[PDB]
Design a protein around this nucleic acid. Sequence first.
DNA 1: TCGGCAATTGCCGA
DNA 2: TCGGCAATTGCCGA
Lengths: 70, 88
Amino acid sequence: SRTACKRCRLKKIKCDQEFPSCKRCAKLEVPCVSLDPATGKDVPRSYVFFLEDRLAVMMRVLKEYGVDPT
Amino acid sequence: SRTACKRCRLKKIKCDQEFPSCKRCAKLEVPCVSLDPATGKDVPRSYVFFLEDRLAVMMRVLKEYGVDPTKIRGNIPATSDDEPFDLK
DNA sequence: TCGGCAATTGCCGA
DNA sequence: TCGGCAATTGCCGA
Ligand SMILES: [Zn+2]
Ligand SMILES: [Zn+2]
Ligand SMILES: [Zn+2]
Ligand SMILES: [Zn+2]
C-alpha cells in the first residue's frame, strides 16, 4: 500500500505492492514501473534497486572490454 | 516531495531534498536516510549519491571504449520489458 | 517536539 | 473506468 504503480494508479485499483513489479503487472507481463508525481514521467519502482542493477550490467560489460572499478 | 528523510518525518519538519543530505541532517550532523517507498527499506541518501557517481564513471569509461545506454532488469518507462526472478 | 489540518494519494465498489 | 472517500502524508506553528 505505500506506493502503487503507474498502471494501478491510473487504473484506480488496488496495488499489491511487490518487488520488483507487483503481481498484477507481473501476471499480465506489462513492465511494472512507478510514476513521478512531480514530472509525470515513468520511473522505476526503485531507484537504488535500479542503480544497483544498472552498474552491475555496466560492470559486466566493462569486464568483457577488459576494465574494472575505474 | 514524497521524499522526506526518516529524521524529518519523525520531527515532523520540512526535509531539504538534496543529496547526499537534506539540510537539517547535515547541520544537525546526522546520517540522512530515506525510507524507500517500494521495498520499504532504509536508504542512506548518500549511498545513492555515490552509487550515482559510479554510473558516472562507468558511463565515461564504457563510452570511451566505444559504448553508451545499457539493457537492464528493474526498469524505467512503461515501455521497457519487465522483470523475471533469477533470469533477465 | 507535537496537535493538526491540507494535500495527497490508495482503493472500494458499482 | 471512475466517483469519490479513506488513509497517509509533509510540515506549520506553537
Ligand atoms: Zn500495481
Ligand atoms: Zn505493477
Ligand atoms: Zn530531511
Ligand atoms: Zn535528512
